[PDB]
Design a protein around this ligand. Structure first.
Ligand SMILES: O=C(O)CNC(=O)Cc1c[nH]c2ccccc12
Ligand SMILES: O=C(O)CNC(=O)Cc1c[nH]c2ccccc12
Ligand SMILES: *Cc1c(COP(=O)(O)O)cnc(C)c1O
Ligand SMILES: *Cc1c(COP(=O)(O)O)cnc(C)c1O
Ligand code: NA
Ligand code: NA
Lengths: 394, 257, 394, 257
């Protein structure tokens, strides 16, 4: 029995062992109550203004579009404190954790971005944070590791299964049933069991609402299409939400194509996997004929989740958003374009979102179109990876 | 469903609790797994509980995570697991055989078909570790239609709504997970005419089997414990088989009283 | 003959070879004209809103001050695009470079921050950028190097003298006299020859003016003291400027003390060196009994300039600001405090500014005082250095 | 000041331009530097221009940057440089001796004292490479008071204001740096009764010495060129001294006409 819907058409639900049910239901009731709570809403509004740096600017990119009929703006969540949009919803899941009387945070991370995020919000808000990271992600992300320990979090490496992000998500779900009376499980994407897809959307939704007002004021009309990358779905559903009811606006989500869809080495389950139930939910997954779950592959760490948020599978099924894919190459080009033309170094995640907007302009250069790309983080974390590639080739 | 009504009736005539051990199929390999499970039975297991290796077992502790990896290192897949379930039932026609599944393994190629294939090879129950009662409608309906009992966990702090649900929806046995007094959960599951309770998790010495009978349950299930014995004697299969026969013989003699 | 003063009391002036005079004078006239030019002022206001992310929040740090009578706010120039205040004045020196018809930018850099900055503004604004970096700074700052090349700048390593920041500043001044008709020399601190101290102040001054309005609105009165670190002087004079005429406000500049003033291994010429003329100007320098100029030493790359902005020597001489020093240790502590208590990883430069504010509170914990520290950049660039230290000690 | 009025008078009687070579004092070491400079003189240099090594020579090209580093590698300091200036003047009482300084070396322990010490040891001019005319008041006043001529660079695009200033403030010679026609800068510096012009930078073959005389200057200064000869023959001091004597003999024979 739940207060809100757990499903978006067929996809969603709460597929967890019975002993996790009361933690979900208790979360869901905390969240319903906070959303009508005007005090809670002012407390979260004040953290995101004064601490994390909202609103985030909308930058026009005139140099990249010259000699076409594309107007391109970049919503800049790379300027938010900790350098990616992941900060918006950790502040809000930590504030919910306080409202339930909790003192402790559980988190899962892959490349380490969400690990950080949840370590900085737990440091600011006086929570004791422990995080699970697959050992493979441990060893290749020693920068992130050290930052979470600076910020007082305890970091636990998970050696099971494939020892990456999903084996992390698995160890999260195993600890929480022993601890949910003082510990809040701070999931880092718009996916997993209900209520987590709804809550992450609504604590990311100001991406969209400030984009609408900032385009209305600069161009006096709405975008022809908003564009975002899709690893689990949160920055994209945060961009799209407030535009789902303005049916002339385009919603485009971009998945990682890796080496290419045909090699099978990609992260694009939404258009290229099959409906399964895993991590709590019924959604598209990367899995065998047989049903074992696989890893995604992307040059971008942050998009490597072999499933996707259920609200994204739903808005694909009814044709209100469209989903496509960009290859490791494509995204490396769009990363070099933005550094040399606009002096903005984007995250390899967001570079796929921009790669598709550059093909939208390059394919049809005299189509008049107003395009916003959500540039979901910066890309300092990625310059060794791109130098090592470029070096390997010359 | 039937084998388990037969076995509880038979055990009630003798004033005996059931002892049910759990193993992962194909650990540490398909041939070894078959000899482990004929050993558990000859030693006196009353029923088996048997898991199919799943790449992401979010409900299992470490001992069982490592049993999965071992089966995967030998190449075990769901298909070989249903192959092994047929040979085990051809040798042992009356033992109740229950599977512990994850949801995607059942939902993978159609939930009806999966409960049909269990009916074919002769399985009697399936408990889906990540399907709570609130999501369980299709899986219970389908299991019902193929004469397979859907098993539910009843956690130790179950409120009355849940007790009522678990008693109404389950068959075969109620999996009674070890705040909330035993003596209450047990009485209430009888009152609502639930399937007989088996207490499980943490069950690893004879005295807990006697205790769970005295508290009113019908028996007990042991798995981490059996799985460790395998993990410890991998290098000497013959000694593995000896320690398993000893442990199981002790546990099932404690149910006699 | 000049339009504005070149001196702040005794310090300042234009001490350059005669053949650089016309480039200075031409700069100074371009700048006078732009400052009355309302169009120029709207163009710069729009880059700093939409591109670089102004205004920068003012964060209250309640966790660090608990159980004392200190209220501490952090002006957050770490949230400005490129991660340090250096971005404010490159946008404005590049806009001036355009107003003169120039197409080319010369820059000097040490640790690489100002190198970046001037590469991103030259990429955005369509200037061709070449930068000089001492080879010693080259080799230890390969991250920065690669970023400037991503962003299209040409980078030249200088092997002369000590092959660090000052030998860079020397090669800048050598190329410009052959090129100042199409090339603007984009100096990266409030120091060098007139007009560069005045121009860098006035393109950094919005640090201060938004701090005043943001404290007035949050606390209804002005700060008892504003606090900033002093490597050449620009972020500090940008914080202080608009408060020099509110004589109850404290201006405190903090110099690097290195290993300690007594070891002689420091960067604190303002209080511990002697008046000399070098890089164009008369100001305090780190020099021998004999007059050769030396390097500063700081764990922080960014503060290692063996001289200081002349306007800072002037406001020290008349007692309107005070200057002090913080040691490599002191600043490493204040960097670990802020990461664990507020979930903000500060630059090792800004950590000295915070180190002195923490001693202001810790020394007298029941003094009622409202303190703003200008947190001039973030500190991701510095986590390998701090992990390597902490590791060397255990 | 006097030695340079004497030498230009003497050279005017003979219808000859002056040839002035530049060297860094103490390069490549103090003893070698002394023998380089007695060689330049015996070969026919009319005047010397002599630089004191400064840690940051922002007005010098690469050849002279490397001459500084070499003097620093031998340990040369301003004090040893004033020591060497005394021995050079004790041997050569009439040659005009001008220094090329940076501002901090002069301002270091008081600008008056520095021009006093030049007066003591017998220097006749100092050109401060980073002091433009607009900053030059104290340095010219002080130099004047100690009977030392302050030398100014007159750049090739000098406007009329600057010409007027350079002619009024300088003494000894005007350093005429090699848009704007020669023939104009030269006539104007005579018109405003400036110190006689010496053309310098880029002067590295005999024919440019003849040309600068014909254009109306009083002579020419060569330094990068002399400095490279040192840089090239470091390993053979005797050959260094031979090539320097040859080059200087050629340049000064071109001033004869
Ligand atoms: O491990 C035990 O002692 C008992 N375990 C079982 O009965 C089998 C089991 C493996 N994984 C599970 C998840 C949920 C319920 C039972 C299991
Ligand atoms: O190098 C030359 O050919 C001439 N150089 C000089 O006359 C001496 C000199 C060294 N550095 C300078 C800076 C300004 C003016 C002269 C010099
Ligand atoms: C993690 C991350 C992503 C991917 O997650 P979403 O939940 O799909 O939004 C995208 N961009 C950045 C910068 C990230 O750090
Ligand atoms: C370069 C830098 C400084 C030092 O220069 P100032 O001109 O003295 O302000 C201080 N903080 C940061 C973050 C820097 O990047
Ligand atoms: Na995905
Ligand atoms: Na300094």
């Amino acid at each position: 029995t739940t207060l809100l819907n757990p499903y978006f058409g067929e996809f969603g639900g709460m597929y967890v062992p019975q002993i996790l049910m009361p933690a979900l239901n208790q979360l869901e009731e905390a969240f319903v109550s906070a959303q009508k709570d005007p005090e809670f809403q002012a407390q979260f509004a004040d953290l995101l203004k004064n601490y994390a740096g909202r609103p985030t600017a909308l930058t026009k990119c005139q140099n990249i579009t010259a000699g076409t009929r594309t107007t391109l703006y970049l919503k800049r969540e790379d300027l938010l404190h900790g350098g990616a949009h992941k900060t918006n919803q950790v502040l809000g899941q930590a504030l919910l954790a306080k409202r339930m009387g909790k003192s402790e945070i559980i988190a899962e991370t892959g490349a380490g971005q969400h690990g950080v995020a949840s370590a900085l919000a737990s440091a600011l808000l006086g929570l004791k944070c422990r995080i699970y990271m697959g050992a493979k992600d441990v060893e290749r992300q020693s920068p992130n590791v050290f930052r979470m320990r600076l910020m007082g979090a305890e970091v636990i490496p998970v050696h099971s299964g494939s020892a990456t992000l999903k084996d992390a998500c698995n160890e999260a779900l195993r600890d929480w049933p022993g601890s949910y009376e003082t510990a809040h499980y701070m999931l880092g994407t718009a996916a997993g069991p209900h209520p987590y897809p709804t809550i992450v959307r609504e604590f990311q939704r100001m991406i969209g609402e400030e984009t609408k007002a900032q385009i209305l004021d600069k161009e006096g009309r709405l975008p022809d299409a908003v564009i975002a990358c899709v690893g689990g779905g949160s920055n994209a559903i945060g961009m799209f939400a407030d535009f789902i009811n303005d049916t002339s606006v385009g919603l485009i989500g971009v998945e990682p194509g890796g080496h290419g869809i045909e090699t099978g080495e990609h992260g694009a389950p939404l258009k290229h996997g099959r409906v399964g139930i895993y991590f709590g939910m019924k959604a598209p997954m990367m899995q065998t004929a047989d049903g074992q779950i696989e890893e995604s592959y992307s040059i971008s760490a942050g998009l490597d989740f072999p499933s996707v948020g259920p609200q994204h599978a739903y808005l694909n099924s009814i044709g209100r958003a469209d989903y496509v894919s960009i290859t490791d190459d494509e995204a490396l080009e769009a990363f070099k374009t933005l550094c040399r033309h606009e002096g903005i170094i984007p995250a390899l995640e967001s570079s796929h979102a921009l790669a598709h907007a550059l093909k939208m302009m390059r394919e049809q250069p005299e189509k008049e179109q107003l395009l916003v790309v959500n540039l979901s983080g910066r890309g300092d974390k990625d310059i060794f990876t791109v130098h090592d590639i470029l070096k390997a080739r010359g | 469903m039937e084998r388990y009504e037969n076995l509880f009736a038979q055990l009630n005539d003798r004033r005996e609790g059931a002892f049910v051990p759990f193993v992962t199929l194909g650990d540490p390999g398909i041939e070894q797994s078959l000899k482990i499970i004929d050993t558990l039975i000859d030693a006196g297991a009353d029923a088996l509980e048997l898991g199919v290796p799943f790449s992401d077992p979010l409900a299992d502790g470490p001992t069982i995570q490592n049993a999965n990896l071992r089966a995967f290192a030998a190449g075990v897949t769901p298909a070989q697991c249903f192959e092994m379930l047929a040979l085990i039932r051809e040798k042992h026609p009356t033992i109740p055989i229950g599977l512990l599944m994850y949801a995607n393994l059942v939902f993978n190629n159609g939930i009806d078909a999966f409960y049909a294939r269990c009916e074919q090879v002769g399985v009697d129950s399936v408990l889906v570790a990540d399907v709570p009662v609130e999501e369980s409608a299709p899986f219970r309906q389908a299991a019902l239609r193929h004469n397979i009992a859907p098993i539910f966990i009843c956690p130790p702090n179950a409120d009355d709504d849940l007790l009522r649900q678990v008693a109404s929806y389950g068959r075969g046995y109620t999996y009674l997970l070890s705040a909330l007094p035993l003596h209450h959960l047990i009485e209430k599951l009888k009152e609502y005419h639930a399937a007989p309770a088996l207490q499980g998790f943490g069950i690893s010495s004879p005295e807990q089997v006697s205790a769970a009978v005295r508290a009113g349950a019908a028996g007990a299930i042991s798995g981490s414990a059996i799985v460790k014995i395998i993990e410890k004697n991998l290098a000497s299969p013959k000694q593995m088989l000896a320690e398993l026969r000893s442990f199981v013989s002790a546990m099932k003699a404690a149910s006699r009283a």
